[PDB]
Design a protein around this ligand. Structure first.
Ligand SMILES: NC(=O)c1ccc[n+]([C@@H]2O[C@H](COP(=O)([O-])OP(=O)(O)OC[C@H]3O[C@@H](n4cnc5c(N)ncnc54)[C@H](OP(=O)(O)O)[C@@H]3O)[C@@H](O)[C@H]2O)c1
Ligand SMILES: [Zn+2]
Lengths: 318, 42
């Protein structure tokens, strides 16, 4: 019934930002943690009426944590590797929340530890989340865990790793990745659908979702289909090319390099499932039930892709 | 048609706000469930 106060971290991130916009819009209060006020998103969120930001780091920063949870009834926690030890952080947060004693529903955004379901390696920026999940369960916090599918908007024609929808000279598009071209992958439209879904989960309470793992994915497509989709929207020739290794056309920091290396092995070498969890091995059923106004690849490719490019400074849409 | 909120032109099902005005599945659904117009980035 009544709207609550939600604590969120990494406010500028695609998952948080999505929730924040929708949460504030319907009447909820938002206490959010941002690493910096400088930035488009930052200023945007800074602008939304019932949003209160706290600028500071999460690593070894319990003071902020305590503040953030003051008067909070809900929480959507989704960290990044850019902030430091994601487990020391994810643990402190969960401790903060418990100390607050007012959290009714604590949704943590989790990811698989592939080395636990096969002879595979632990993907560097996913596996640590799984450890924090268990810790949340351990504290007994009324929680629900979400596993986000890969973002439709990771795509860009720019020289960024793994998800480059490259604009060939002849005006065609090509996507080169280690992923099998025939194997469906779990997709998700972060900006468009994370907010609405998390809202609906909160709207349901731990009475329904406590202890549950939910796959935040609204559609499954194989690389070839992804391309068939971009090709459907832009009315151009988009073709997929399976490459043994991830192409790194620019300078990237270690963590992302190691991350990609693991990805090469797990998806390229071992042809493994994005969600190696027995429960996630349709996976889109629950997600679609929670939010049925999701945005598929076709609409993304057509309606958003072009725009995002444009903003990034490109011009083939003109 | 085009959505009056997000202005998309790609949607699985078209909707009508309390004014018969054209909304997309998302915008229309969000409004219906929460009471306010779907908030858009930017
Ligand atoms: N992309 C996918 O397909 C996918 C799928 C499943 C899970 N994930 C997970 O999503 C998590 C990331 O969350 P997200 O997608 O919501 O974020 P995101 O949109 O990828 O954005 C990354 C964020 O970190 C902030 N940041 C940059 N430098 C930082 C620093 N030094 N310290 C602290 N924060 C810093 C950025 O803020 P500013 O812009 O303000 O600098 C930005 O909001 C990752 O753990 C990833 O594994 C991604
Ligand atoms: Zn719309």
């Amino acid at each position: 019934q009544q709207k609550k106060t939600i604590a969120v971290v990494n406010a500028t991130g695609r998952q948080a930002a999505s929730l924040i916009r929708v949460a504030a819009a319907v009447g909820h209060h938002v206490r959010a943690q941002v690493h910096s006020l400088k930035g488009l998103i930052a200023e945007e969120l800074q602008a939304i009426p019932n949003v209160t930001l706290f600028q500071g780091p999460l690593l070894n920063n319990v003071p902020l944590m305590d503040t953030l949870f003051e008067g909070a009834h809900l929480a959507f926690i989704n960290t990044t590797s850019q902030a430091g030890d994601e487990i020391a952080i994810g643990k402190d947060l969960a401790d903060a929340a418990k100390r607050a004693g007012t959290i009714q529903h604590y949704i943590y955004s989790s990811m698989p530890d592939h080395s636990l379901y096969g002879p595979w390696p632990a993907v560097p920026m996913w596996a640590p989340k799984f450890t924090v999940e268990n810790y949340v369960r351990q504290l007994g916090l009324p929680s629900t865990f979400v596993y986000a599918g890969i973002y439709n908007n990771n795509f860009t024609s720019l020289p960024y790793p793994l998800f480059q929808m490259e604009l060939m000279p002849d005006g065609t598009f090509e996507w080169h990745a280690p992923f099998d071209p025939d194997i469906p992958l779990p997709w998700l439209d972060a900006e468009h659908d994370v907010g609405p879904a998390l809202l609906q989960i909160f709207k349901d309470g731990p009475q329904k979702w406590n202890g549950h793992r939910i796959a935040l994915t609204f559609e499954t497509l194989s690389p070839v289909q992804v391309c068939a989709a971009f090709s459907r929207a832009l009315n151009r020739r988009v073709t997929y090319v399976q490459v043994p290794k991830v192409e790194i056309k620019v300078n990237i920091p270690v963590g992302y390099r190691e991350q990609l290396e693991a990805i090469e092995v797990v998806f390229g070498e071992h042809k493994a499932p994005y969600f190696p969890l027995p429960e996630f091995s349709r996976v889109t059923d629950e997600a679609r039930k929670l939010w049925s106004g999701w945005r598929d690849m076709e609409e993304y490719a057509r309606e958003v892709f072009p725009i995002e490019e444009e903003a990034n400074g490109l011009d083939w849409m003109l | 048609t085009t959505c009056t909120n997000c202005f998309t032109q790609t949607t699985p099902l078209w909707r009508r706000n309390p004014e018969g005005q054209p909304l997309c599945n998302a915008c229309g659904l969000f409004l219906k469930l929460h009471g306010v117009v779907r908030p858009l980035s930017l």
